[PDB]
Amino acid sequence: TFWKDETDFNLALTSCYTPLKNALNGGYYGTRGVMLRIARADEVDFRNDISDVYTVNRFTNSNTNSLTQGMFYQFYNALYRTNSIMQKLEEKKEQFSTDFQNSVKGECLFIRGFYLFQLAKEFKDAPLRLTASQSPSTFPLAKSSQADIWAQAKEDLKTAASLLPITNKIGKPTQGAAYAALGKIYVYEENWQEAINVLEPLTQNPYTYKLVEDFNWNFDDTHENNAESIFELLIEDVWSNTRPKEYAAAEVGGWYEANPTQQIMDIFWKEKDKDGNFDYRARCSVAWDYEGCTYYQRPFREVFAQDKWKTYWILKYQNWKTQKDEPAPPKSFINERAIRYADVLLMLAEAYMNKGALDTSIGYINQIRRRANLNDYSGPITKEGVFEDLVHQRAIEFFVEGERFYDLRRWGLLEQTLKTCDDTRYKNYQTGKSDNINKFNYFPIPAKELDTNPLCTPSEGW
């Protein structure tokens, strides 16, 4: 049996990240999870191949969607694992040094808090399981509110931050990762003072976080664990199906599953850089018909026939400059950067703007602008001005990193942003409007859960 020594507990901990890596069943950072995360904003249109993603993209999904179901249950698999470790550690604490106990608890609570965050971010109100039975329990359990789930997540992440080291092996959390995750929960709750409290210190000694000079190093193989990295996942490192082939054009052997919308391209192109060129972030994120655009190591206009010169293609997290194709199986893996320092800077910008330190906020925005070789912020020194560029910089900075939908949602900008993006998607989205909510703002509790758990009420609007 297991649980015998420090090595066994360390192996258990590593296994708690596996549900984030799951490819086909809704693991959060696996290919299908990524699709669900990017599908609902104005970033991309999906083709109608992977039906459960297409319905999500189009706002026609139901509470039987197998992929959103899978996402739900992956979260609970991970919770079961983290709860089990906590229980086993308590049971066996007498054989472990207090230092080892602290290391395990710190990591385990980081992991539990991160998953709890995502659970209530995606499903709003949901059953809150903080104990693990011998088997994952199918006993009935009424939902907890988003606030209560996030309360647990904050408690976990506070304790984690206090116990974790300033540096760690790649894929293992640091105190900075715990603080940054905690800060994000404060941002989502509009607790601006506490966001500032936990995030501002991350910009100072003894931390070493910095924006990398080359934005693209955040999304490559060779600069994994770079100086901007806060927490990264090694997806291939796991009680074949990877991201880049999905988004590459048929012309280079891919499955062309999604393309950037006109609206998102308009956002990328709006403001040119100090030298008059397109924002380097846009040039790292999408391929389109501009002079010198390359795609899989050929000129754009040579890869694509003339009738396709007006199309748009995703580059972020693709092998678009290291390779000429996307073979299957993949030759290498590009870690998912779950948290990076740009996130801390833009979260501070947002917190300071909302609290009323506009100059401070602008300073943080300008760090982001300067890395991208843009002029500094030139909008009015007002909350509304600074908010307009916050939104704009986040859209460009975190394209297809799974932020845009949740951002638009929490800001109350989603409805108007979909309105300008596509008439039919907007029409479908508006069918979800009832009372003062929209049912499409969160994935519904799956039909399977409502059937198996009679104390669970359906999601509002569903």
Identify whether the C-beta of residue 210 lies closer than 8 Å to the C-beta of residue 230.
no
Give the residue, chosen from 15, 18, 25, 66, that forms a contact with Ca ion under the rule CB under 5 A: 66
Is 66 annotated in a binding site? The answer is yes
Residue 105 near Cl ion by CB under 5 A:
no
Is 224 annotated in a binding site? The answer is yes
Instruction: Output phi, psi for 259, to 5 deg.
Output: -135, 145
Gap between the Cα atoms of 274 and 370, Å rounded:
9
Residues 160-189 that bind Ca ion (CB under 5 A): 175
Q: Which is nearer to Ca ion, 108 or 349 (CB)?
A: 108
Is 134 annotated in a binding site? The answer is no
DSSP string across 190-256? T-HHHHHHHHGGGGSTT------SSGGGGGSSTTTT-TTEEEEE-TT------HHHHHS-GGGT---
Give the residue, chosen from 29, 192, 399, 443, that forms a contact with Cl ion under the rule CB under 5 A: 192
Identify whether the C-beta of residue 165 lies closer than 8 Å to the C-beta of residue 174.
yes
Give the residue, chosen from 3, 96, 100, 333, that forms a contact with Ca ion under the rule CB under 5 A: 333
Q: Tell me the closest approach of the beta carbon of residue 336 to Ca ion, in angstroms.
A: 10
∠ CA 114-119-123, rounded to 5°? 155
> Site for Cl ion (CB under 5 A): how many residues?
16
Gap between the Cα atoms of 62 and 84, Å rounded:
33
Among Cl ion, Ca ion, none, what binds residue 58 when CB lies within 5 to 8 Å by partner kind? Answer: Cl ion
C-alpha closest to that of 403 among 209, 216, 264, 247: 264
Give the residue, chosen from 90, 190, 214, 221, that forms a contact with Ca ion under the rule CB under 5 A: 221
Residues 383-402 that bind Cl ion (CB under 5 A): none
Q: Which is nearer to Ca ion, 262 or 378 (CB)?
A: 262
Give the residue, chosen from 48, 145, 225, 420, that forms a contact with Ca ion under the rule CB under 5 A: 420
Is 261 annotated in a binding site? The answer is no
Residue 62 near Cl ion by CB under 5 A:
yes
Gap between the Cα atoms of 387 and 373, Å rounded:
20
Calculate Rg over the CA atoms of the chain.
22
Residue 412 near Cl ion by CB under 5 A:
yes
DSSP string across 362-406? HHHHHHHHHHTTPPPP-S-SSHHHHHHHHHHHHHHHTTTTT-HHH
Among Cl ion, Ca ion, none, what binds residue 193 when CB lies within 5 to 8 Å by partner kind? Answer: Cl ion
C-alpha closest to that of 394 among 418, 419, 411: 411
Q: Which is nearer to Ca ion, 175 or 285 (CB)?
A: 175
Q: Which is nearer to Cl ion, 225 or 420 (CB)?
A: 225
Gap between the Cα atoms of 77 and 18, Å rounded:
9
Among Ca ion, Cl ion, none, what binds residue 169 when CB lies within 5 to 8 Å by partner kind? Answer: Cl ion
Q: Tell me the closest approach of the beta carbon of residue 149 to Cl ion, in angstroms.
A: 21
Whose structure tokens read 């048929």?
Answer: 250
Give the residue, chosen from 58, 81, 340, 394, that forms a contact with Cl ion under the rule CB under 5 A: 58
Among Cl ion, Ca ion, none, what binds residue 175 when CB lies within 5 to 8 Å by partner kind? Answer: Ca ion
Residue 225 near Ca ion by CB under 5 A:
no
Residue 236 near Ca ion by CB under 5 A:
no
Among Cl ion, Ca ion, none, what binds residue 3 when CB lies within 5 to 8 Å by partner kind? Answer: none
Residue 311 near Cl ion by CB under 5 A:
yes
Is 164 annotated in a binding site? The answer is yes
- The residues, any chain, with a CB within 8 Å of residue 364's CB and separated by 6 or more, are 345, 346, 348, 349, 352
As a three-state string, the secondary structure of 14-40 is: HHCCHHHHCCCCCCCCCHHHHHHHHCC
Residue 15 near Ca ion by CB under 5 A:
no
Instruction: Output phi, psi for 434, to 5 deg.
Output: -155, 145
Whose structure tokens read 């399981």?
Answer: 129
Binding site membership for Ca(2+): which residues? 66, 164, 175, 221, 224, 276, 333, 415, 420
Which residues make up the interface to Cl ion (CB under 5 A)?
A: 55, 58, 61-62, 65, 169-170, 192-193, 225, 259, 311-312, 412, 414-415
Binding site membership: which residues? 66, 164, 175, 221, 224, 276, 333, 415, 420
Which residues make up the interface to Ca ion (CB under 5 A)?
A: 66, 175, 221, 333, 420
